[PDB]
Point group: C2
């Protein structure tokens, strides 16, 4: 149906801002909601964003989501980088067909 493409890595120093893009290969990004997950080594995925830009309870406002119709992409922005933010990040949407599609994953290193 479609793929979601992510850069395999990003790094940044503590206190800085980092952006991770998720690009949909076919059909419009805005046809279905985008979610973002944080995964630490040995643990399960943790929702940081759902419905393109909503934060679950307990997720700090350092985490934000946005959609760019024109590049057919979603982005996750992390400001005030802390060393605990080091983790894998995945974007995720639906098919229509309805079925889940995961992006390839971005490994974030805090320098």
């Amino acid at each position: 149906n479609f793929m979601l493409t992510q850069p395999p890595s990003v790094s940044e120093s503590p206190g800085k801002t980092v952006t991770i893009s998720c690009t949909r290969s076919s059909g419009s990004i805005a046809s279905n909601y985008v979610q973002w997950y944080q995964q630490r080594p040995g643990s399960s995925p943790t929702t940081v964003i759902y419905e393109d830009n909503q934060r679950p309870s307990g997720v700090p406002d350092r985490f934000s989501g946005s959609i760019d119709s024109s590049s057919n992409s979603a982005s996750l922005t992390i400001s005030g980088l802390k060393t605990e933010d080091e983790a894998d990040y995945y974007c995720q949407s639906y098919d229509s067909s309805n079925h889940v599609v995961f992006g390839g994953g971005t490994k974030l290193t805090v320098l």
Copy 2:
């Protein structure tokens, strides 16, 4: 809303059968569909089962899903164990507030 609890680990010899369970903490397991993912180290989650028991194209019939009461659980069964099956396995469903819920994950070791 609810949690999905899984055993942290399972192990078994090549050619054998292993079962991994997923237990819902409140509400019925049958209220929403259950999905299973395989995740190898360094990679993103791959669907092995969706809609309780459906296999995506290219997933071998060694992988099967089922659902039970009396215990409020879903299970993933892997027959004919191969050393490539070594990975983490996650169950996943939806609340009604619709939002995704992930299990804690099971690490499968092939002996």
